[PDB]
Amino acid sequence: IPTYDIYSRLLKDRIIMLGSQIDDNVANSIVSQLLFLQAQDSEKDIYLYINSPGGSVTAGFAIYDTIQHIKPDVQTICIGMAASMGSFLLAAGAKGKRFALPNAEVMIHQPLGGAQGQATEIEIAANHILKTREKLNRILSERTGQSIEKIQQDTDRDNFLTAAEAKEYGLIDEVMEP
Amino acid sequence: IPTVAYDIYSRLLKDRIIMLGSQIDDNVANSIVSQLLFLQAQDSEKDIYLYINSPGGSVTAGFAIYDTIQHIKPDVQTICIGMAASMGSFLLAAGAKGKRFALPNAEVMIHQPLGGAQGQATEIEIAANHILKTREKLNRILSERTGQSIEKIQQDTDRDNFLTAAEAKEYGLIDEVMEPE
Amino acid sequence: IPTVYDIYSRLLKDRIIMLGSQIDDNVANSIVSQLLFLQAQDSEKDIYLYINSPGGSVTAGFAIYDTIQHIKPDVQTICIGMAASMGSFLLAAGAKGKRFALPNAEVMIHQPLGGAQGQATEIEIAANHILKTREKLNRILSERTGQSIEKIQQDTDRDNFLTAAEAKEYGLIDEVMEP
Amino acid sequence: IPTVRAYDIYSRLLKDRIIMLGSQIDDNVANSIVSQLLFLQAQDSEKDIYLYINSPGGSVTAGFAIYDTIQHIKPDVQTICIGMAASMGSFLLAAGAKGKRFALPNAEVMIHQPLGGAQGQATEIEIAANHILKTREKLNRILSERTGQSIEKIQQDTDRDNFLTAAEAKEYGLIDEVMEP
Amino acid sequence: IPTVIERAYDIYSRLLKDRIIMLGSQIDDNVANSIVSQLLFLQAQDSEKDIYLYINSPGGSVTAGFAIYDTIQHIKPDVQTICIGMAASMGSFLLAAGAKGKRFALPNAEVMIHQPLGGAQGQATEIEIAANHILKTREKLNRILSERTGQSIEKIQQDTDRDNFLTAAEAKEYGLIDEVMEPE
Amino acid sequence: IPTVYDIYSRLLKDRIIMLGSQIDDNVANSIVSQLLFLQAQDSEKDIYLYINSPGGSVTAGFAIYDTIQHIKPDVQTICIGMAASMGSFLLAAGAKGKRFALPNAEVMIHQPLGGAQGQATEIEIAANHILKTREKLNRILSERTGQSIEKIQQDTDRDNFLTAAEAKEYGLIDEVMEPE
Amino acid sequence: IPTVIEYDIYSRLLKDRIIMLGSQIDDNVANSIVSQLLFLQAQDSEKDIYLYINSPGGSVTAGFAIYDTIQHIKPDVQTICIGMAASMGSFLLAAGAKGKRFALPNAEVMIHQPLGGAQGQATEIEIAANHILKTREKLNRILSERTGQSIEKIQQDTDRDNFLTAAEAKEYGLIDEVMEPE
Amino acid sequence: IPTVYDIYSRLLKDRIIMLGSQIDDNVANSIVSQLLFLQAQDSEKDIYLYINSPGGSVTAGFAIYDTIQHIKPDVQTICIGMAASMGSFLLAAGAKGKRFALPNAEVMIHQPLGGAQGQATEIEIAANHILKTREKLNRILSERTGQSIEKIQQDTDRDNFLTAAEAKEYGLIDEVMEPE
Amino acid sequence: IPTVAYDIYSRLLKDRIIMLGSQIDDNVANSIVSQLLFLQAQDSEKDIYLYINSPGGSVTAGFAIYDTIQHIKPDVQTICIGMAASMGSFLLAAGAKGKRFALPNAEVMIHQPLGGAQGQATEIEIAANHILKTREKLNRILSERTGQSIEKIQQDTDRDNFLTAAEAKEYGLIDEVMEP
Amino acid sequence: IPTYDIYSRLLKDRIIMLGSQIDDNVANSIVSQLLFLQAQDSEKDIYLYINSPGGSVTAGFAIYDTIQHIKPDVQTICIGMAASMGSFLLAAGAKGKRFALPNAEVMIHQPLGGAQGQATEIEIAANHILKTREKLNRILSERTGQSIEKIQQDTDRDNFLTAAEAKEYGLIDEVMEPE
Amino acid sequence: IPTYDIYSRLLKDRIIMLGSQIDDNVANSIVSQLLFLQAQDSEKDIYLYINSPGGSVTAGFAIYDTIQHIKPDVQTICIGMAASMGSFLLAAGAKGKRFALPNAEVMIHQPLGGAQGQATEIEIAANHILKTREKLNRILSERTGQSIEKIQQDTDRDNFLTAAEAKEYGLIDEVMEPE
C-alpha cells in the first residue's frame, strides 16, 4: 500500500512478490511482470519471492512455463510459506538460485480437485487429475533429483518440510542465512 | 393421508400392495424392505404387487430393494405408473419375469449412474473406479433382466433415454403394457 | 382437518376423492391408492373426483390418468374453483357424460413447462422429451374433447382461460352443474 | 386445540352444522369447507348450515369453490361475520342465503378489487391482465346480484380498500341483519 | 401439555369441561377462532352457568379481539374475566368486556392500555384510507372502553395516547375490572 | 417423553408439577392450569412444585405467583439444579416452611431485564415501568424472605449466585433437603 | 410408515426379533438400537436377533454403544447387510455372531479410517489426535479379531475408502456368507 | 497490480494483449477495443494475444474472433496455463503459423453449455439455437484445424483435455514454444 | 481496463468510436448519449462508429440512445460484434441506412418486449396497456427501418427469433455483412 | 466513465445529465452543478437532460427550487423516460425551453410513501403526504396550465404519456424533432 | 488516510507501522518495506512500531526471518498491544533495541490451529503444529534468555505481561519513558 507502491518500487529492482494464493489473476500479473522484466533486460536475474499456500495448477504452470521460457535466470526465495503449487514454483527457480529463509515452511502434497455428474464424466475428470499429478511428479523429479516413485510416496499426504529439509530433498539449493 | 383405523397405504398393504412413489433413499428402502419381509412372513406363496412411480435415487438403497425382491419366495409384480426413471426403472425390470407391467402412458427412463468426488487425486480415482464398477454391476443385471447385450445397455444409458410403455416392452424392461380393464 | 376419521376419510367412505392441491408424486400416490382401494371395495359403483388444482407434474398426473382409465368403476370429475394445466387434463379424463364443472369454476389449458441445463446434447434430449410429452397430451386431449390435434396445439400455445360454459363448448366437460 | 369419542372443538361444532372459516382462503381451506358442506348436506339436506366468517380473504378461485358449493347444495347456508370479512371473505359473507346473512355489531367488512401479478412477454402480460379483468367483472356481477347495488357502483366502491361497519354493510346489501346481543 | 385421567384430556380440555377458557397467547385469527368456538360450545352445553375466561395476553389483532368481544356480548351466559400476569392492548379490552361485577385481576397482574398500532404503504390515497380506518378503529375502541369503565371518551383518548401501565388496584379504580381477587 | 400418560401427567396424578424450563406465557399457562386442576381435585392436600428454571417473563412468573398465593392448598417448592431470576422468585413463593433446595442446587437473584426503543417519552415510559416492576419484585421478596427492601435492592443489583445453604440463610428457602 | 393389524412396520418386525438399522449412526439411533436389543433379551435371552444393516456409518462412540451391547447380551445377533454397510456400519456388520453375518449378493461393504476434527491450542490438537489414533487402533484391533486378517493388513486396507462386493466381504472375513435367493 | 503505466498497459504499448480470465461481454469489449487500437497505431506489426482462459460466453468469444479475422495485423496466440472451451477456440483463431502453446499448457475442447426454461416451444427454440451455435463452432474449428466436422463433433461430446503437443497434432496450434 | 492518459475507451472515443458492450440500462444510456452529444459538438460532419455487443435491456434507456442517434447531425454507423439481442438489435437497425453492419459470426435476435405487473386489477391493466403500446411503437419503427410489414414484424417477434448476420441483412436489420 | 469524465466535459458546455433515480445524493450533485454554472455565467442557459424513473420528493424539490432560484434559464430535455419526480422536474424548466425527444416517455402519478406505528403517527404521516401531493399538484398546475382537479384525476394512477401528449398536456413545450 | 500517505512519509524516515493482525498481506508489505529500507541504506537503523494481536505463524516468520536477514538493525517499539506473533516480532528486534511504552501490553501463548479429515491427516496436522510450537519456543528462548521448559510453561495459556514485566522476562530491553 505505501507510496509507486512498495511493490512497484521492488519491481524496478527486478523483484516480484508472490504473496497470495495462485489463481488466474495472480498468474496473469506474475507472467506480465516476467515478460516486462525480460523486455527491459534479457540478461539480469529476476528475483521471485514466494509466500503462497498454492492454488490453481494451470495458473501455476502459466508462471512455471514463463519462468522456463524467458532468457533471464529467475531466482526463487521462499519467505514464510511455499505450499503445493507454491513449493512447485519454488523448485522451478534457476538451479543453484533457489532459496528459503531458515524458518520458511515448504509443503508438498498431491493435487486436489472435484468431479460431479455421470460416471463417464467422473472418469474423465479422474483421468485428467491423475495425468496432472503425473506431469507434476515428473517435473518435480527432474528439478529435485528424486525418483518419481519417491515423489509419489512423499506427496501422497500433506508433507511439511523445514527449509533445511527442503534443501535435503532438492526443492531448494541453499538456506539463505542471516 | 386419508383414513380407512388405517391410512390408505397400510390398507393397501393388507392386500399385499406396496406403493413406491418417491425418490429412493435409505429411509424409503427400509420401509419397502420391511414391507416385503412382512408380507413373506404372512404368506410366502401369494404374489406381491409393487407399484412404482419414482424418479430414482440412491443406487445402494435401490439394491436393498432389488436383493430383497430376489431373495423372498413370493413373486413381486412391478407396475409402473407415471414415471420409472434411473434406479426406479431398474426396480421395474426387477419384478418377477412375466409379471412386469407399465400403464400405457407411463414413462420409463434409463441412464448411467450419477455421483461426485472431491479431494486428492487418489480419492477421486477411488470414487471413479467405484462408480464405474457400480455401473458395470447395473448393466450386467439389466442385461440379465432384459435380454439385451451389456454393450447395448452401455450405449443406451450413455445419456438420458426416455421410453414409452410400448418401447419399454420392446426393450425387455417390462413384460406387458396393462391395457384398460 | 375436522374429525367426524377426518373429513376427507369420511367422504372417501362415500367414494368421494378430493383433489385440491398441486399435482406432485405424493398427491398422485394418494389419489391412485384411493382409486385402487375404491375399486377393490366395489368395482361397480361410481367414483367422484373433485378437482381444484393449478396442475403440477405431468408424469404424476398421468399416474392418476392411467389409473382412472384402468379401473372398472366410472370416475366422475367435478371441477370446483380451478382446473388448470394437468388439472384440466384430469378433469377431461372423467367418464364421458360424467365430467362436470360448477358455474364459476375456471378451466385453463396451456402447453407443458419444463427446464434444461448443461450441454447442447442434453438440452436437445430434454427438448425432444418435452415436445414428445406435449404431443402425447394433445393427442389424448383431442380424443376426449373431440377437437382436432392442431386445434388443441393452437389453443394451448399460451395460457387459455375458459369459463365452465366455454369448457363445455370445448369438450373438456359434459355439463355445467346447475344448483 | 381443546378436546371434547374424542373431538376437537371444531368437530364438535361441525356436529351442530356449524363451520368455522377463521383464516385466509387458499386451496387447502376451500377443500376443508367444501368437504364439510358436502358432508352436512349428505347427513341432512334440510337443516340450515351455519358458516362463521373471520377471514382477510385469499384466493379468488378457492373462494369460488366455496361460493359455488354453497349455491349448489340444498341446505341454506347462513353466513355470520365475526371480527373481519375482507376481500374474498366479504364475497362469501354476501353469498349466504338471502335473509340469513349476518354480522356482529363490531365486525368489519372490507371490499376491494382483486389482486394479481404478471411476468414475461407482452402477450403473456396481456393474457394475465385480461384474465384478472374478467375475474373482477365476474365478482362484481355476482356482487351486484347479491347486494342490489349497480355494477357501476360496485366498480367505483371497490376501486380501493373500502372498509364498512356492520351497519354500513347492511345498508350496502352485503348482509341482511346486524345480529344484536 | 399434561394429560388428565377421567377418557383422556389435555389440561386445557379438562378445564373446558368446567367452563374455563384459557387465553394465554397473542390474539390472532386462530386464537380468536378457538375462543369463539369454545364460547359457542359452552353456551350450547348450558346457557345459564357462568363461563370463566382467564386472560394472560399481550394483545394482538384488533379485529380478532372483536370476534371474541362480540361473542362474549352475544351469548346468554355471563363471561367472567380473570387477568393473571398481563392483559395488554386488546387483552385489557377483553378483560373489560367481562360481565359487569365479574371482571377480576389477581393482585400482581398487569394491565396496559394504549392506542392501536398499524401500518400503511403505497399511494397517498391508500395511506389516507388506512389512516382513516385505524382512526375510526380507535374511536370504536375508545367508545366501548368508555361505556365499560365509566370514564369519559376524552379521558380514554388521553390515557391511551401512550403506553399506560396499571396495577390491578389501579385497574379497578379505572373501571377496567370490578375487584382485585385476594388470596382465599 | 416416556409413557407410563406421559411421565409428567403421571406425576401430576400425585399432585407434582415439574417446572424445568424457561418461564414464558405458555409455561405459565400450563402451570396455572395444573394448579387450578389440582385445587379442584382436592383443596386440602399439598401440591409439590419442582423448579429447575433460568427465569423468564416477569408477567408470566407473576401469573404463577398469584395463582400459588390464591389457591387453598399449600404449594411446596423444590429447587433442583438451578432457580435463577423469576425462577428463584417462584422458589421463595412456596408455602412457608415448605420451600426446599437440594444440596447442590443453585439459586440466583438479580434485577429484571428489559428494553426500550423510540421517542424520549416512550423510553421514559418503559423505564418507569421496569422500575415499578423491580420495586414490586423487591417488595414481595422482602415479605417472603424477611430481608429489608434496601438489602434486596443491593443484592439484586448484579447477578447474585447462592448455594442452597446460603439461600436458606438468606430466607429464599426454609430447608436444604438432605438425602433420606 | 405403514401400520399393521394384530404397530408400524418396524414394530411388527421387532416382535419377530428383527431390528432395522437403515440410517446414519448417531446417539439417537444407537440409543434406539441398544434399547431394542435389551428389550429383545428381556423377552428371550436365548433366541437369535436379526439386525439388518443399511448404513453409511456415523458416530464411532454411538456404534460402540451398539457393538458392546451386541457382545454383552446372551442372544446371538445376526447381521444382514442390504444395500450398503460403510464405515461404522461395516464394523457393526462384522460384529454379528460368527457364522451369522450375511450380505445380500449386490450389497456393498466399505471400510476406511475414522474421521474427525480438532480446533484450538497445540495441546488441544495433540489431545484430539492421540484420541482419534487410539480410536482407530481399537477399531482395527477388533476388526482383525473378527475377520482373521492381520492388523497391519487391516491398517493398509482402511487407509483410504475401500469398497468390497458381498463376495469379497466374505473372502475378507467381514461376513460369513453371501445370502443367496433361498 | 504493479506500476511501471500499470503492467498490462505497458505490455499493450508493445502490442501485447492479456486474456487471462473468463470470457464475458466486458472482457470481449476490452479485447476488441485493444485490437482496434493496435491496428489504428500500426496495421502492419503483429499483435500478440496471450490466452489463459477457462472459456466463457460464446457470443463474447465470437466478438473477439471476428475482430481478429477482420483487422489487418496478424494476431499471434500464445496459450499459457489453460485454454479451455471458448478459450481454446480463440487459441486456434490466431494467424496460421503463429499459434503457440507453452510446453505444460493445457488445452480443453468440449461442446457449448447452456440452459432453457419455460414452455415446450421456448425450450425447442433454445435447443435449436444452441445446436446451431455448436454447428457454427465446429465448422470454423474444422477450417482452422483441418479436422473433419464429424471428428470435431465426436471429440467435443465430452470434456477433451489435450497437452500442448497433442494440441499441435490436432491442429489447434502450430508449434509448441520451447524455451529460449 | 488498459491505459493508453486515457483508458482504452476514451482513446477510441477520440477517433469517434463508441463501444456498447453490455446490457442496456439508464447508466449505459447516459454514457452513450453523452458520448453521442459530445462527438456532435466536436464535429457535426464526421461519421460516428457505434459497436454493439448487447443482450438488450431497458426499452426506454434504448430509446434515449435511439432518439439521440436520430437527432444528431453526424451519421452513426452501427457494427454488431458477437450479439445484438432485444433492444440491442433495435439499436443496430437504428444506424444510418447503408452503414449498418454485422461481423460474419455475429448473432442478431429479435423478440417482443418483456415486463411485469403487480397489484390491483386496474394497475395490471395500466401496465399491460403500456407494454402493448411500447411493442407497437417498437414494431412501427422496426418496420420503417427494415422495410418489413408490421404484421410480419409482429409474427417474427412473437418468440425469440435468432438470425445469423447474413439473415439479418436479408431481413433489413443491417445493410452489409462486414467481410475480412 | 470515459476520459475529465464525459459528464464533466459536458458540464463545461453547461450540460447536466440527470439519468438515474432521484435521491439526496443525486439532488445534491445536480444542485451543486446548477449553483456552479450560475457562478461561472449567470446569463447563458443551462441544459438539464432528464432520464429518470423518479425518486425522493424532497430531493426533487431541492433540484426544483434551485432551478427556480438561479438566474440562468434551465432547459429541460427528456430522453427515454421522465417518470414521477422526473416528469415534475421536466415541467420545471424555463417555459418555452422544455423538450422531449419524439419517442421519449413521460409518466405522472401521485406520490408514494409509508407509515408505521400508532394511529396518531399514521395520521400525521397521511396528512403530510396529502399536503405533499397538493403542493405537487398546485405547482404542476402552474407549470402546465391544467386545473388542479385535472391533475388530481390524471395522477390518481400511473399515467403514461407520449412526447406529443406531454406537449399537449403542458409538461413540455416542444417535441424536439431530428434536425 | 491523511496525505504520500502518512505511512509512506514515515517510511521515508525508515519507520514501519505494524498496526493490524498479521496475515500474508501484512507480512508481504512489511517484508517489502524492510528490503526497500535496506536497499536505501544498509546501515541506518529501522524502526518497527508494533500494535498487533498476532495472526499467521508463517506470515510472522516471513517478517521474522527478513528482520534477521537484513543488515540494518531493526528496532521494535510496542504501543498498545503485542500479542501472540506480535509479541514474537517484538522480541525479534535488535538486542538492546526492543522497547515498550509504559502502558503497552504483551501477551504470549501457544499457537492456534485446526485439523479435519482422516486420523492420519489429523496426526500430520498435530505433528506439524507441535513442531511449530517447538520452533517458536526455541527462538523465544534464544531471544529472551529463558529456558525452553520455562517458555513452554509460560505459554501454555494466555499470559499477559505489563511493559515492566516484559523487560523482566527479556522480551524487551527497555520501557521507553516520556521524553
Numbering used by the authors:
A (entry chain M): 4 to 6, 18 to 192
B (entry chain E): 4 to 7, 17 to 193
C (entry chain D): 4 to 7, 18 to 192
D (entry chain C): 4 to 7, 16 to 192
E (entry chain B): 4 to 9, 16 to 193
F (entry chain A), H (entry chain N): 4 to 7, 18 to 193
G (entry chain F): 4 to 9, 18 to 193
I (entry chain H): 4 to 7, 17 to 192
Give the authors' words.
Bacterial caseinolytic protease P subunit (ClpP) is important and vital for cell survival and infectivity. The caseinolytic protease P (ClpP) subunit is a compartmentalized structure with two stacked heptameric rings that form a central chamber containing 14 identical catalytic sites sequestered by two protective axial pores. In any case, even the degradation of small oligopeptides depends on some structural factors, and the most important one is the orientation and positioning of the catalytic triads formed by Ser98, His123, and Asp17224. The protein’s mode of action corresponds to that of a chymotrypsin-like protease, and it is described in two main steps: acylation and deacylation.
However, when the same assays are performed with a SeClpP sample supplemented with 20% w/v glycerol, an increase in peptidolytic activity is not observed. This simple triol is known as chemical chaperone and protein stabilizer, and if used in cell lysis and purification steps, the ClpP sample becomes homogenized with a higher concentration of extended tetradecamers, as noticeable during size-exclusion chromatography, where only one peak is observed. Conversely, glycerol revokes the positive cooperativity, since it stabilizes the tetradecameric SeClpP, also organizing the binding channels.
